[PDB]
Design a protein around this ligand. Sequence first.
Ligand SMILES: Nc1nc(N)c2ccsc2n1
Length: 134
Amino acid sequence: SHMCDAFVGTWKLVSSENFDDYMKEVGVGFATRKVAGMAKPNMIISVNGDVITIKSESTFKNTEISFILGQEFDEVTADDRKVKSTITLDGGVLVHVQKWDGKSTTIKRKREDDKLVVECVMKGVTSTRVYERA
Ligand SMILES: Nc1nc(N)c2ccsc2n1
């Protein structure tokens, strides 16, 4: 048993709050915000040794990241930003920081009851995205 066991699995988005405002704060344009805001992504998390893989699949885009905790990597986000990402574990919470164009956003993923709760923060704006097991 290991680090992220309770995150591993296939998850489906069941609720979202303030995601449009988060996307605005990030700089996402109108058409992408409207189309991306409809999606109910599946998040598939797996671990193989030190390598964590998070796939996110939706009608809008399929994305995939693989990474080692604490080790920066390149990520192309669903809204087509080219970012430099670092993901760490902080007291059981996966903390994902994305840097691009002098900007920064942080995405936190945590287990709460039977849900996986995703909190996306850009300056003063937070969006909460709740996933349940598929
Ligand atoms: N693949 C993918 N991943 C995401 N996080 C989102 C959010 C809206 S659409 C979408 N598609």
